[PDB]
Amino acid sequence: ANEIMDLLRGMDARLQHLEQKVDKVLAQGSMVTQIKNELSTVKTTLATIEGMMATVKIMDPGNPTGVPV
Amino acid sequence: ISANEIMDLLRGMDARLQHLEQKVDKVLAQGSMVTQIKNELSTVKTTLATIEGMMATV
Amino acid sequence: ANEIMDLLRGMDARLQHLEQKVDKVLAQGSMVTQIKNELSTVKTTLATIEGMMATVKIMD
Amino acid sequence: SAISANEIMDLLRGMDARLQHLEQKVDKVLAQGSMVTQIKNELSTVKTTLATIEGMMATVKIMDPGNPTGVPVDELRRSFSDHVTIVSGPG
């Protein structure tokens, strides 16, 4: 009779910390979002470096400049 | 009498499971975000690999 | 009563569905491993780049 | 009530097992956020060093030696004679 109710509260309790463990992982996305925001700046600085290298490469006078189309 | 309290606790169980469902769906969404960051960072890596070469010739 | 236990047969069926779905959520392990590998690679390759940058020669 | 008894048996023991797998799953995924914040720090270091190399690259010297010794043009032609299609900037 009452034993089943006892184990029932036991289940409620178990699930209650299921929430906690999950609450933690949901809160783990904080970096994921920031790292995306800052990776945007990493991307633009990378692109600038790549463009500078392309420009210096084509600045050599041995091989003349050929524009696509 | 007890069956009424049991009804309430089991209904609360259902609600708790719905909460877990939503939270873990948000976890799947975070996973979609991390996969986007995956492909984009791979593109960044490939670009950096492409530039290391000119480093010497120039 | 009986109605409640039928509601729990439905609800824990939803529970088996929940665990089935989070089985897919488990997949990001090797995923984060891969992303760690790529960025570490990025770090190593930019190491070479900064290494060759500091030099006495002037670019021609 | 015995029928209800084994019905309970099935409904409870089962969900208990499922929750056991569930707690094993979260136990396995708890390290993902930690390794993520590591990747965060290293990524910040990468951003810092990429920024400083951009800083050094903002100031570079490009020098053309020319023909100082006056060596003949005959061997001096070390250049490709054809237009080469290399994409620069946009493309």
Author numbering:
A (entry chain B): 218 to 286
B (entry chain E): 216 to 273
C (entry chain D): 218 to 277
D (entry chain C): 214 to 304
Q: What does the original paper state about this entry?
A:
To catalyze the RNA synthesis in both replication and transcription, L sequentially consists of five domains: the RNA-dependent RNA polymerase domain (RdRp), polyribonucleotidyl transferase domain (PRNTase), connector domain (CD), methyltransferase domain (MTase), and C-terminal domain (CTD). P harbors an oligomerization domain (POD) for self-oligomerization, and the oligomeric P attaches to RdRp of L, tethering the polymerase to NC to extract the RNA strand for both replication and transcription. Here, we resolved two L–P complex conformations from the mumps virus (MuV), a typical member of nsNSVs, via cryogenic-electron microscopy.
In both conformations, parallel P tetramers are revealed around MuV L, which, together with structures of other nsNSVs, demonstrates the diverse origins of the L-binding X domain of P. Our study links varying structures of nsNSV polymerase complexes with genome replication and transcription and points to a sliding model for polymerase complexes to advance along the RNA templates. In cryo-EM maps, four P molecules assemble like a kettle spout stably anchored to L. Our cryo-EM structures capture the clear interface between two P molecules (depicted as P1 and P4, respectively) and L, involving the RdRp, POD, PLinker2, and PCTD regions. In this study, we observed that P tetramerizes more probably in a parallel pattern when constituted in complex with L. Due to the moderate resolution of P tetramer, we could not recognize the kink at Gly246, the unique feature to identify the helix orientation, and we could not rule out the possibility of MuV P tetramer in an anti-parallel configuration. Therefore, the involvement of L may guide the assembly of P monomers in EBOV, MuV, and others. Residues from 249 to 299 of P are the major region interacting with L.
